[PDB]
């Protein structure tokens, strides 16, 4: 996977460089920056994890689309401003899953399929 | 517009807070942070600008999708790592439009509709 493929997906998932560097790579931000600028090759394990996260974004989008089908109206999704807000609902400080919820909800909200709330959002 | 609606769209556009603060609000990064945390209300002009940038995102997605239809195969899109790369192609150092090209290209790449290149991509 190239440096700009890696960056495009990392940004699309709403990961910060420091979060991706720590949770996906087991490396410093400077190393992840090198992977994103082409200064060092992207390790294949990292490319695989990034593609699997991209697949999960797609799957979550599909599940929310099925929920929208059942509801007959746009559903509500929680947009968690902070990891604490996410933790309040899930009990876990899972950075990558938190950013994933942000990416899914933001995409659906922009495309008109969903409304956003801080607390009433639909589960699963 | 609520504070988390503003943040979700700002992030989906791939804008940094300092970029949104300078180019969209005419305000400091701290003031934009306040709009995104709920400490100050989102000005209606800013909300309008954000909604229009979101419309442009959707519109660029539609045009690229039409280009893919006409091509009969995946097309190549430039993913500009830096504002310099963007300017080299467009002749303009338009931060907001640059981030928009990144967001469009990243979504289409994730869905498999497009390949990414650093140079030579199909222009629109």
Residue B122 domain-assigned (yes or no): no
Chain B residue numbers with beta carbons less than 8 Å from the beta carbon of A3 are 81
Contact yes or no for A79/B7 (Cβ under 8 A): yes
Domain of B96, in residue numbers? 3-117
- Hunting for tokens 């650093």 — which residue is that? B118
The first and second tokens of residue B38, run together, are 């709920």
The first and second tokens of residue A39, run together, are 């200064």
Contact yes or no for A2/A46 (Cβ under 8 A): no
Contact yes or no for A32/A25 (Cβ under 8 A): yes
Residue B123 domain-assigned (yes or no): no
Question: What's the CATH number where A109 sits?
Answer: 1.10.3100.10
Smallest CA–CA distance, residue B71 to chain A, in Å, is: 22
Chain B residue numbers with beta carbons less than 8 Å from the beta carbon of A54 are 110
Experimental approach was X-ray
**Cβ A79–B111 below 8 Å, yes or no?**
no
Distance CA B1, CA B51 (A): 10
Residue B55 domain-assigned (yes or no): yes
Residue B55, CB half-sphere, CA atoms under 13 Å: how many? 6
Contact yes or no for B4/A81 (Cβ under 8 A): yes
Resolution of the structure, angstroms: 1.9
- Kindly tell me the sign of the dihedral angle through the C-alpha atoms of A99, A103, A109, A114: negative
The first and second tokens of residue A41, run together, are 């090759």
Go through chain B and tell me how many residues it has.
124
Would you tell me how many other CB atoms lie within 10 Å of the CB of residue B62? 10
Residue B68 domain-assigned (yes or no): yes
Name the packing angle between helices A95-110 and B3-12 (round to 10°): 90
Q: What Å distances lie between residue A49 and B21, B27, B57, B113, B120, CA to CA?
A: 33, 38, 27, 20, 28
Residue B51 domain-assigned (yes or no): yes
* Domain total in chain B: 1
The first and second tokens of residue B60, run together, are 């660029």
């Amino acid at each position: 996977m190239t440096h700009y493929e890696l960056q495009a997906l990392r940004k699309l998932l709403m990961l910060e460089v420091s979060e991706a560097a720590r949770e996906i790579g087991d490396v410093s931000p400077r190393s992840w920056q090198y992977w994103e600028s082409g200064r060092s090759p992207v390790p294949d394990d990292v490319a695989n994890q990034i593609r699997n996260l991209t697949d999960m974004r797609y799957q979550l989008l599909e599940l929310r689309t099925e929920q929208i089908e059942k509801a007959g109206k746009p559903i509500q999704l929680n947009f968690y401003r902070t990891l604490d807000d996410y933790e309040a609902v899930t009990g876990k400080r899972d950075v990558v899953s938190w950013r994933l919820t942000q990416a899914v909800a933001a995409t659906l909200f922009a495309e008109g399929d969903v409304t956003l709330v801080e607390q009433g959002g639909l589960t699963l």
